[PDB]
Amino acid sequence: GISRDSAHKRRATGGKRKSLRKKRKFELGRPAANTKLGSGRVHKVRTRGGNTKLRALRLETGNFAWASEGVARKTRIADVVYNASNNELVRTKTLVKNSIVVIDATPFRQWYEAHYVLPLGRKRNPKHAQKEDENDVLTKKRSEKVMKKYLERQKYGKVEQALEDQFTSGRILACISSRPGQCGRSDGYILEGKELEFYLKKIKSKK
Amino acid sequence: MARGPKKHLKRLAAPKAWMLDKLGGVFAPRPSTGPHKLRESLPLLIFLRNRLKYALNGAEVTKIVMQRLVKVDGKVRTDPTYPAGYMDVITLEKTGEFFRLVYDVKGRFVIHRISAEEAKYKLCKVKKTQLGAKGVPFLVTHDGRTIRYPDPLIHANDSVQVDIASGKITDYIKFDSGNLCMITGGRNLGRVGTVVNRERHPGSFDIVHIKDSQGHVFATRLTNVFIIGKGNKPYISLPKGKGVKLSIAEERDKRLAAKTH
RNA sequence: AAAUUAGAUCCGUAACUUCGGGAUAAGGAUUGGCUCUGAAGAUUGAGAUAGUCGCGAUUAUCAAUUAACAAUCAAUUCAGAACUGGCACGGACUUGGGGAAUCCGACUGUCUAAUUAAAAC
RNA sequence: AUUCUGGUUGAUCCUGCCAGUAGUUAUAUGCUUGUCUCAAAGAUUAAGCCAUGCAUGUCUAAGUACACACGAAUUAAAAGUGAAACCGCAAAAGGCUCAUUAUAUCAGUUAUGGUUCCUUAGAUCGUUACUUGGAUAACUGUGGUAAUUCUAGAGCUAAUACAUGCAAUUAAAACAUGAACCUUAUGGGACGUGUGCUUUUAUUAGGCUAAAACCAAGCGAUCGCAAGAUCGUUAUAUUGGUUGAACUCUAGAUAACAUGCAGAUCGUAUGGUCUUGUACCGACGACAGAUCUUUCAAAUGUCUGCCCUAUCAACUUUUGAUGGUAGUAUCUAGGACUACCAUGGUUGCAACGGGUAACGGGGAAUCAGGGUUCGAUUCCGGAGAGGGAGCCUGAGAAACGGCUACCACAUCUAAGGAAGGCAGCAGGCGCGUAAAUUACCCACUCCCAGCUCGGGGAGGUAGUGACGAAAAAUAAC
RNA sequence: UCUGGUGCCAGCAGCCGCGGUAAUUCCAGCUCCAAUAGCGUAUAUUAAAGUUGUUGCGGUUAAAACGUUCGUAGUUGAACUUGUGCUUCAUACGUAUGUAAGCGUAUUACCGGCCGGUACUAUUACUUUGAACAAAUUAGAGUGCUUAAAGCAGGCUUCAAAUGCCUGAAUAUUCUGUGCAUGGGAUAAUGAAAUAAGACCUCUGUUCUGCUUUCAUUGGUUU
RNA sequence: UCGCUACUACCGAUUGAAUUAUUUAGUGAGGUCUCCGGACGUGAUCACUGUGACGUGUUACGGUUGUUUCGCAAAAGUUGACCGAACUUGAUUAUUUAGAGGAAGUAAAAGUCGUAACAAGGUUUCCGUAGGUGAACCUGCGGAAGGAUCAUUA
Structure with missing residues (x-):
């Protein structure tokens, strides 16, 4: 099969090592995943001793985690924008580790004003001319049960300018942090502070 | 494999x-x-x-x-x-x-x-105190009898006596510079007691100096060193007479030459 | 006589040798269309901080830029990838067959306008 | 058991080689041989081919037993022996050989915190019928082709095989979320909800020297009439951890995650309790369980150490060479593989190339020492099964006494097709200077299985045997 | 220095050499000598070999100093540093310190009862003793397999009854070197202080870095 | 030197011949993985049909039915990658071998020709270098004594 250790592959002087141990199983390699953005496939491969890992060709959904929260909301995966290993992997939309990715931005925002009821980032006020009627069904204060906890915050609720602009579009930049050919999933964190400003300078200034 | x-x-x-x-x-x-x-x-x-x-x-x-x-x-x-x-x-x-x-x-x-x-009951030394077995604590023994919930002052390099009906600690003998010991694994095998000083080599392979009752100071690795009580404390019964560090000719003089027959 | 080869890119290339060569040696691979991707330039850079007078017009600057500084603008060439059909792709045209020797003249040059271009001069 | 003699001259002293000399588990061969104890033995040439035969199978009272094949008696308990067949395990060890292989194997040292692991022992197992679904061998029955090997069609039936499935999975407790609670504070609640492990991602703590000057709640406590003002006690930077350490590590909590896994099993006894009524519980073992810790290991990497050759001086890098970087892939590190940058890396202290009649090491032969030569060969390690490549199942194989193809050789054929690898043990051809029986048994040493009992040309044991070692007929008075 | 045969023939002989009608060497008879269930021959290999030379050769003439000198790699490199003296006492016989203690201004600071925890170690080669690691082999301890090479057993009270005893089944070269621990500090290299980025000091607070203890809890003012 | 008889090793047209491994290109069996695929064999709904039951409005049991909804897997075959045997061609090595002719060497003294050297070998020898000659050799230039001079000549 594909082999993974140096039976071939000449030495540090430049010299050809000759033959070396006909071909052994324990140094095998496998054909890759190339997990596209097709919805829902997993093949599982029987690995070294007794085990199994999940070769997840064609995934579509991922357990993404806003790292500055301690939250991890599952979304779907929309676009594969940037990748440092290649551009053959961007263009064919293949998911491997840290591809910069675009997810949903919605299951975080509903989680955001659940615990951090402060409305931001706010959309166009022509839509916001009336509520149904949210600001009392948010907290209502009870005089006084569990819920004054929503106002010794507002120290947390000033998420940065370059992230709240990316929430109003309803799609946010994230980053894969799993091994989709191995772990069977494409999870990850999202770009917030300076991982953001690097990977976004990489896009709009290059074009 | x-x-x-x-x-x-x-x-x-x-x-x-x-x-x-x-x-x-x-x-x-x-x-x-x-x-x-x-x-x-x-x-x-x-x-x-x-x-x-x-x-x-x-x-x-x-x-x-x-x-x-x-x-x-x-x-x-x-x-x-x-x-x-x-x-x-x-x-x-x-x-x-x-x-x-x-x-x-x-x-x-x-x-x-x-x-x-x-x-x-028998005496056995400890190897690795660790968390994870029920509930948090456990230690592993030199034969490998993992036993849960031990005393928090038993570190490594010590021995505990295990009862053969239970699996529970009853006494711990810890590694100080006053405790008699026993060697198993090297050239110095079978020689019993007592400790002098341990040379800690950071990373790795500490050796320790052992003085027999004849004054015969010697040394071996800390891997080979069991521990069987304090100074002049046989906490188990030992076999034939302690492993005196006999001479090579004296065993040919004790019973081989000085022989009633 | 005719056929074969032929453009270009890449790899590779023997005997001899006056060390210049031979040599485009020989021998092989690649080549269309379509969608992108990369690389190779130029020109102003871009200036951050009172307010008189009523932000507005008369209205500031050493340097640090910087590691894609940011737009404009400019030509064209070269590498890469994916898909894609009757393998037809240098699709017409333009366009070398090669090699092992022997003889003569070294070479380029010249000659019998109208039968000899040579080894002759 | 640190020694030398003959041979150059008409004779001499030398240099010098030749010839003698002795050992060789060192091969052949020549002649002869009365014992006897041990005993090497197709390595050299052909890792060149091979007739035949065998070398891997396995059952406990304890996975499944509808055989009259044999046991008994109207009890389903037959619990007997259990053939078969299923399932579980093993067949990856051993045994043979030395073609390949020149820092490669190997030896020592050190590593794996860069991994993985059947077994073995040890610890461990709550957050809607509880007792189940269907379908096959064995078995019956009828068949096919040159051909036994191969297999179809139908009728039956099992489980610790395959599949589903816990009403105590049971909450209080723990604890978010609301909730009938409602107070100038190191302050309080019924209940509705939710909280297996494992994988994945993400977060936060992470092993730790001492006090006040001053200050808002003035609660503990004090003073001012008080609005209150000045102060202040401890439980509060509360997880093993190498005792070399941001070990991303074994632990824990938080926010999720998807998707699986989760004890519908078996022999011997049963009495506590009889209403003999599924009200009442031992000791055992398991196709098995899961996590952690061990263990038999492996596989990589560290630092040194290898023969002949310069009539081999520069090599590597298009097509990975040296590094960076992100990935993929693997059990895991890593140019191992990809993409992008950097231009490195080895070298007269011999790189690179070539040769090898080279498997490496323990060790063997021979000397006073220093040494030279050898090691196919019983032990450890590597390597391979005609030549290469590929691969399935399996914890473990790039397995060949497994498969698949190509190549070379051969085989059967009724011409359609089917199977084969003795460098296992014997045996035959062949090549050769050069090497034995187509024998006997598992009592030994151990190995394997469901495992006191089966199997094991592993192993022991006779036959051949002047390879080699030892004690000693061939006379004595 | 046997007897017949042959006559540079047949042949023998590792080499030197024999044999040409007297052969101590051939071929045979008669004898003899070596080792002996053995011994001869062939090839290889070690010793012989001071003919491969580290121990340990040779180079004027026997084989052998480059025609000459430069010269890098390499190999080798002058001397120099706390050496001892006294005072001693422990110790072979007024003599002998061979263990040590006292002057060369301080061979590392505390507590313990001279003695332990204890803070601090210019370096490498060499060397001491160790650690650490397969067995067989080898060296070889012990032992009447009858002996022997082997073997790892066996032996005793005892001819016994008798869990009735006793002890085995060594220690080492090796697996030479690398690497580690420890003693030494002779020998041999490197190292340091130059108009001082020299040392202790002027311990000045000019500058520091930091963070766990207390500001009840918990926040601000800040030493 | 030459001539006869042998033996070894060279040079050499043939751009000879036979291997041996190692590869560039080319084709290419198989297999892993993958894109589809969906024999047969169920699930299962859609209706129901056989009957009874309720209020014929609805349902219970049978028809391996009718036949549409909805799955579940899954063989052949396939698309693309990747490992890659294998043959065909080229180059590169590393050995071995046939060759007209040519030319050195050895053994073989007993052949021919001459006498080169060693005696002051009758021209002292030797060396380096060039040319010449049937052959040993000769001659020039330079050197050396291994010479036939260790030299006596204020």
Whole structure:
């Protein structure tokens, strides 16, 4: 099969090592995943001793985690924008580790004003001319049960300018942090502070 | 794993710390992977036919151990080749034997018939205190008996006496510069007590200096060092007389030359 | 006589040798269309901090830029990838068959306008 | 048991080689041989081919038993022996050989905190019928082709095989979320909800020297009439951890995650309790369980150490060479593989190339020492099964006494097709200077299985045997 | 220095050499000598070999100093540093310190009862003793397999009855070197202080870094 | 030197011949993986049909039914990658071998021709270098004594 250790592959002087141990199983390699953005496939491969890992060709959904929260909301995966290993992997939309990715931005925002009821980032006020009627069904204060906890915050609720602009579009930049050919999933964190400003300078200034 | 794992083992390749003869067969007892390692074992074809001479063939040992007459550490152990290493109390209540495997000063082991009252507990050293087994704490023993919920002052490099009916600690003997010890594994095998000083080499292989009752100061690795009590404290019964660090000619002068016959 | 080869890119290339060569030696691979991707330039850079007078017009600057500084603008060439059909792709045209020797003249040059271009001069 | 003699001259002293000399587990061969104890033995040439035969199978009272094949008696308990067949395990060890291989194997040292692991022992197992579904061998029955090997069609039936499935999975407790609670504070609640492990991602703590000057709640406590003002006690930077350490590590909590896994099993006894009524519980073992710790190991990497050759001086890098970087892939590190940058890396202290009649090491032969030569060969390690490549199942194999193809050789054929690898043990051809029986048994040493009992040309044991070692007929008075 | 045969023939002989009608060497008879269930021959290999030379050769003439000198790699490199003296006492016989203690201004600071925890170690080669690691082999301890090479057993009370005893089954070269621990500090290299980025000091607070203890809890003012 | 009889090793047209491994290109069996695929064999709904039951409005049991909804897997075959045997071609090595002719060497003294050297070898020898000659050799230039001078000549 594909082999993974140096039976071939000449030495540090430049010299050809000759033959070396006909071909052994324990140094095998496998054909890759190339997990596209097709919805829902997993093949599982029987690995070294007794085990199994999940070769997840064609995934579509991922357990993404806003790292500055301690939250991890599952979304779907929309676009594969940037990748440092290649551009053959961007263009064919293949998911491997840290591809910069675009997810949903919605299951975080509903989680955001659940615990951090402060409305931001706010959309166009022509839509916001009336509520149904949210600001009392948010907290209502009870005089006084569990819920004054929503106002010794507002120290947390000033998420940065370059992230709240990316929430109003309803799609946010994230980053894969799993091994989709191995772990069977494409999870990850999202770009917030300076991982953001690097990977976004990489896009709009290059074009 | 590379087409392993080597179920056979040859005579003149099993150690001569079990005193096997070069003729007598091509093969060797090959202990079946118990608590103790292979080179630190005495498989129960050795202890029954070669030593106690209860048998005379190899077939006359499975006609002993399968009837549950043998009893290693309180449990039965009908394995015909169970490893049964250091201080494993083979408590034969029939026919009332009560051994313990303690190692001789000549690098070898010695048959030591012990008292039946102190047979039912044995002394064993600790290796790694760690979390994770129930609930948080546990330590691993030199034979590997993991025992849960220990004393928080038993660190590594110490020994605890384990009762053979329970699996519970009753006394700990910790590693200070006043405690007599015992060596198992090197050239200094069988020599008993007492500690002087330990040279800590950071990363790795600490050695320690041991002074015998003859004033015979010597040294060995900290891996080989068991511990069997404080100063002039035999907490277990020892075999023949302590492993004095006999001279080479004195054993040829004690009983070989000075011989009544 | 005719056929074979032929453009270009890449790899590779023997005997001899006046060390210049031989040599485009020989021998092989690649080549269309379509969608992108990379690389190779130029020109102003871009200036952050009172308010008189009523931000507005008369209205500031050493340097640090910087590691894609940011837009404009400019030509064209070269590498890469994916898909894609009757393998038809240098699709017409333009366009070397090669090699092992022997003889003569070294070479380029010249000659019998109208039968000899040579080894002759 | 640190020694030398003959041979150059008409004779001499030398240099010098030749010839003698002795050992060789060192091969052949020549002649002869009365014992006897041990005993090497197709390595050299052909890792060149091979007739025949065998070398891997396995059952406990304890996975499944509808055989009259044999046991007994109207009890389903037959619990007997259990053939078969299923399932579980093993067939990856051993045994043979030395073609390949020149820092490669190997030896020592050290590592794996860069991994993985059947077994073995040890510890461990709550957050809607509880007792189940269908379908096959064995078995019956009828068949096919040159051909036994191969297999179809139908009728039956099992489980620790396959599949589903816990009403105590049971909450209080723990604890978010609301909730009938409602007070100038190191302050309080019924209940509705939710909280297996494992994987994945993410977060936060992470092993730790001492006090006040001053200050809002003035609660503990004090003073001012008080609005209150000045102060202040401890439980509060509360997890093993190498005792070399941001070990991403074994632990824990938080926010999720998807998707699986989760004890519908078996022999011997049963009485506590009889209403003999599924009200009442032992000791054992398991196709098995899961996590952690061990163990038999492996596989990589560290630092040194290898023969002949310069009539081999520069090599490597398009097509990975040296590094960076992100990935993929693997059990895991890593140019191992990809993409992008950097231009490195080895070298007269011999790189690179070539040769090898080279498997490496333990060791063997021979000397006073220093040494030279050898090691196919019983032990450890590597390597391979006609030549290469591929691969399935399996904890473990790039397995060949497994498969698949190509190549070379051969085989059967009724011409359609089917199977084969003795460098296992014997045996035959062949090549050769050069090497034995187509024998006997598992009592030994151990190995394997469901495992006191089966199997094991592993192993022991006779036959051949002047390879080699030892004690000693061939006379004595 | 036997007897017949042959006559540079047949042949023998590792080499030197024999044999040409007297052969101590051939071929045979008669004898003799070596080792002996053995011994001869062939090839290889070690010793012989001071003919491969580290121990340990040779180079004027026997084989052999480059025609000459430069010269890098390499190999080798002058001397120099706390050496001892006294005072001693422990110790072979007024003599002998061979263990040590006292002057060369301080061979590392505390507590313990001279003695332990204890803070601090220019370096490498060499060397001491160790650690650490397969067995067989080898060296070889012990032992009447009858002996022997082997073997790892066996022996005793004892001719016994008798879990009735006793002890075995060494220690080492090896697996030479690398690497580790420890003692030494002769020998041999490197190292340091130059108009001082020299040392202790002027311990000045000019500058520091930091963070766990207390600001009840918990926040601000800040030493 | 030459001539006869042998023996070894060279040079050499043939751009000879036979291997041996190692590869560039080319084709290419198989297999892993993958894109589809969906024999047969169920699930299962859609209706129901056989009957009874309720209020014929609805349902219970049978028809391996009718036949549409909805799955579940899954063989052949396939698309693309990747490992890659294998043959065909080219180059590169590393050995071995046939060759007209040519030319050195050795053994073989007993052949021919002459006498080169060693005696002051009758021209002292030797060396380096060039040319010449049937052959040993000769001659020039330079050197050396291994010479036939260790030299006596204020």
